[PDB]
Amino acid sequence: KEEIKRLAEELKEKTKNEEIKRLAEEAAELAERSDDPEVLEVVKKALEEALKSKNEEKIELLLLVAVLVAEAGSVDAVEEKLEIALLALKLAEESKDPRIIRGALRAAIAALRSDDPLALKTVKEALERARASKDERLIRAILAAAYAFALLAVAGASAERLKEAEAIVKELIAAAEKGASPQELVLLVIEMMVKGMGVTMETHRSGNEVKVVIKGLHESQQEVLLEAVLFAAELMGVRVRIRFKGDTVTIVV
């Protein structure tokens, strides 16, 4: 257990990437809370492999494994939270796209930080849909919708606002099947946040730039929209420009 903290410390002494430092300590803090030796070895093992690779992208994927296990590895775990970490480790192993591996791992980690049965149900059903597909654009979008849907339930959205977001998830999954562009799919991620936050929305189109201006957002809300869009565009491969001005958020595609 104490050795786990050492490997994480011996990692930041040679690394600088904020994720590598952070995930090293998050996996160590979540270790003590779950004193089941199975967890105390997977984290330790994932740390020793992270000490043996200059590939930082590989390091993060190895540390997200330890954090995902130790979050549900705590005895205070329901069935859904355990089922999400399973599909997220399966769906990540089968794919060779580092985006999908990082996406499915970070989507579950943010999802397992919420005891909300509706959010855990939607994610699990979303993972079971991406695990049952092959079109990687559908998977890179399903993981983006689930991670953004979890960030709303973790932030403390209303039970009515969440159901207005779960419908967008259905819209986001079905529209990608027909073959929606990466940009029209990210625009659905933007709508899920807006509708999930109960704020205004104005859609304008200039050439091939779909400017989206959102108002009435608080800083606690402008950070959830920022962290989600930066995650969705990371998977979908879309150059987005997000502008702020106090109480206004302007997203351009």
Partner 1 sequence: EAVRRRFEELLREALAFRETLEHAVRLARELAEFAASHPEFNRQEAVLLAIELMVRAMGVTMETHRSGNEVKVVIKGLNIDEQVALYRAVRETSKIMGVETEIEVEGDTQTIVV
Partner 2 sequence: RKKELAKEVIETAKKLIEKLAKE
79 part of the interface to partner 2, by CB under 8 A: yes
How many other CB atoms are there within 10 angstroms of residue 195's CB atom?
18
State the nearest-atom distance from the C-beta of 64 to partner 2, in Å.
10
State the nearest-atom distance from the C-beta of 50 to partner 2, in Å.
10
CA torsion 47-48-50-54 (nearest 10°) is 160
Instruction: By CB under 8 A, name the binding residues for partner 1.
Output: 16-19, 21-22, 25, 219, 222-223, 226-227, 230-231, 234, 239-245
Beta carbon nearer to partner 2, 40 or 228: 40
Q: Which residue reads 């590989």 in tokens?
A: 58
89 part of the interface to partner 2, by CB under 8 A: yes
State the nearest-atom distance from the C-beta of 77 to partner 2, in Å.
8
CA torsion 177-180-184-190 (nearest 10°) is 10
Look at residues 119, 97, 105, 116 and name the one whose alpha carbon lies nearest to residue 71.
105
Q: Of residues 93, 202, 209, 223, which one binds partner 2 by CB under 8 A?
A: 93
State the nearest-atom distance from the C-beta of 183 to partner 2, in Å.
32
Amino acid at 66: A
From the list partner 2, partner 1, none, partner contacted by residue 247 (C-beta under 5 to 8 A by kind): none
Residues making up the chain, counted from first to last: 253
Q: Of residues 24, 28, 30, 65, which one binds partner 2 by CB under 8 A?
A: 65
Beta carbon nearer to partner 1, 77 or 242: 242
Is 221 in contact with 199 (CB distance < 8 Å)?
Answer: yes
73 part of the interface to partner 2, by CB under 8 A: yes
Q: Of residues 10, 25, 82, 244, which one binds partner 2 by CB under 8 A?
A: 82
Spatial separation of the C-alpha atoms in residues 30 and 46, rounded to whole Å = 14
69 part of the interface to partner 2, by CB under 8 A: yes
From the list partner 2, partner 1, none, partner contacted by residue 134 (C-beta under 5 to 8 A by kind): none
3: phi then psi, degrees, rounded to nearest 5: -65, -30
Residues contacting residue 128 through CB under 8 Å, at least 6 positions apart: 87
Is 71 in contact with 111 (CB distance < 8 Å)?
Answer: no
Spatial separation of the C-alpha atoms in residues 248 and 251, rounded to whole Å = 10
Binding region for partner 2 (CB under 8 A): 38-39, 42, 45-46, 49, 58, 62, 65, 69, 72-73, 77-79, 82-83, 85-86, 89-90, 92-93
